[PDB]
């Protein structure tokens, strides 16, 4: 699945005013009378899987609307079921966390796009002149997108303190005693000079079939002419896989854990790019 | 020296309103002598972003000075260590940052902000200038006497022997250094965890492999305090037979080498100051 991590708000033009949308009381307040939100020929969806994650469905197959809509029991109990079955339509995936999410998408699932209108078309709140807005934070990459990237600068390197290079790094500084238990990790930001392209050495870390790492943040440009944007990527690639047997609530726990490792990023981010955000 | 990184802007509400005070241009605006009280401060520029910044209250010595009228190229030739202009302080603005060194007898930042204040820095209502320490220098021998350290960042230069094994390592096999400016080694202990034995033994390495280290501790017990600690010293050796263009030179050098972890610093400790 295509992966990353958005901040939510909505604000005047130009982001003046930026105020929290409440997405989970908003969702939340949703389940109990649960109907699909009909968007020109597409059918959106939007179901429980526990109490910070949701599944966020779409069609535009009415054989499918109308099995949804006389399967209720079927419709109620999710978490369990297998993700790739999409019983309930093509599947994203929405973790919320105050103003932050994560949103994962299979090929055909709902895009943050569609979440945007969902939100305006189940009766968000807004102001006149006032918009939702979902905000690309970071961007989940996988190793052959790395090896197509047009420009790579900055490339920070983290190491969980169990891995064995963890170990050979602080020695190589002149550590003597390393109690494992003290520390939590090392990063290595590689920054280069200028604006320079150092993807040469960035693709060969990541690429190292002994990896040295248990996280790789990168700042990079797609193509040429795209914006600097940082983009993350996990050694156990766990959400880049094809689904497969995972149940909605496995997805959901490897979100809730991706946002963890992720999370200091995250709001470093969110407070960059986005600023304040009332609440 | 006394010396550090420090974010300036003018604060107010609650301190959540922060506006930047230009200080480039407002000091290059500028009549170098502010008298406050019994005492006259004096900021003169030595070369490119660094500004000599001195202090007396020998009132003969200020008559001297105001008829003198020193040429930019007298002041840079000057021994730095002499105070023919005033015990001095040096100042190296970038931007909403500054490097600031004081020797023993020169002006404190609280007499740069007086300085900025009496010469018609426009503040609005309940708006300070605020000069904030980001990261103060210090030395090996202050290390010693440090019984707590915590997060910990180790900058090698590119330049570094260990900058090609730490890539090395990471499995990085085709280097071309000239690509690069540095590596940060960021070492983060367990919550509220005390490394200061990793520390210690990289900080007192006799064959030292880093060019700059700044890391948050405790001096004695009871005080998180961001250090940095400068491969050389320089800056922390005493005034001795060097020049203020020297200084200068120094302050910018030092200043282009953290840049990165002054302005991240910055975003933690102050955030965002509206230009």
Redesign the interface.
């Known amino acids: 699945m295509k992966n990353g991590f958005y901040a939510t708000y909505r604000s005047k033009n130009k982001g003046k005013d930026k105020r929290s949308i409440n997405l989970s009381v908003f969702l939340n307040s949703l389940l109990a009378d649960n109907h699909h939100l009909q968007v020109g020929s597409n059918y959106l969806y939007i179901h429980k899987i526990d109490g910070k994650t949701f599944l966020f469905t779409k069609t535009n197959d009415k054989s499918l609307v109308q099995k949804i809509n006389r399967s209720k029991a079927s419709v109620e109990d999710i978490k369990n079921s297998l993700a790739d079955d999409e019983s309930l339509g093509f599947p994203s995936f929405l973790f919320v966390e105050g103003d932050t999410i994560g949103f994962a998408r299979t090929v055909f699932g709902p895009t943050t796009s569609d979440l945007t209108d969902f939100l305006i078309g189940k009766g968000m709140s807004l102001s006149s002149g006032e918009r939702v807005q979902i905000e690309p934070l970071m961007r989940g990459t996988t190793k052959d997108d790395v090896m197509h990237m047009h420009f790579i600068g900055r490339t920070t390197?983290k190491v969980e303190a169990k891995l064995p290079?963890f170990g050979?790094?602080?020695k190589?500084?002149?550590?003597?005693?390393?109690?494992g238990?003290?520390?939590?990790?090392?990063?290595?930001?590689?920054?280069?000079?200028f604006k320079?392209?150092?993807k040469?050495?960035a693709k060969?870390?990541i690429f190292?079939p002994?990896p040295?790492?248990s996280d790789i943040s990168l700042r990079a440009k797609d193509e040429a002419g795209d914006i600097l944007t940082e983009h993350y990527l996990s050694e156990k690639g766990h959400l880049s896989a094809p689904l497969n047997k995972v149940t909605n609530a496995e997805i959901a726990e490897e979100m809730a854990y991706c946002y963890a490792r992720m999370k200091s990023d995250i709001l470093?981010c969110f407070?960059?790019q986005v600023?304040k955000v009332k609440d």
């Open positions: 390197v290079v050979d790094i602080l190589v500084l002149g550590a003597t005693d390393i109690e238990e003290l520390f939590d990790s090392l990063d290595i930001v590689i920054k280069p000079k320079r392209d150092i040469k050495v060969d870390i190292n002994s040295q790492f470093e407070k960059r600023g």
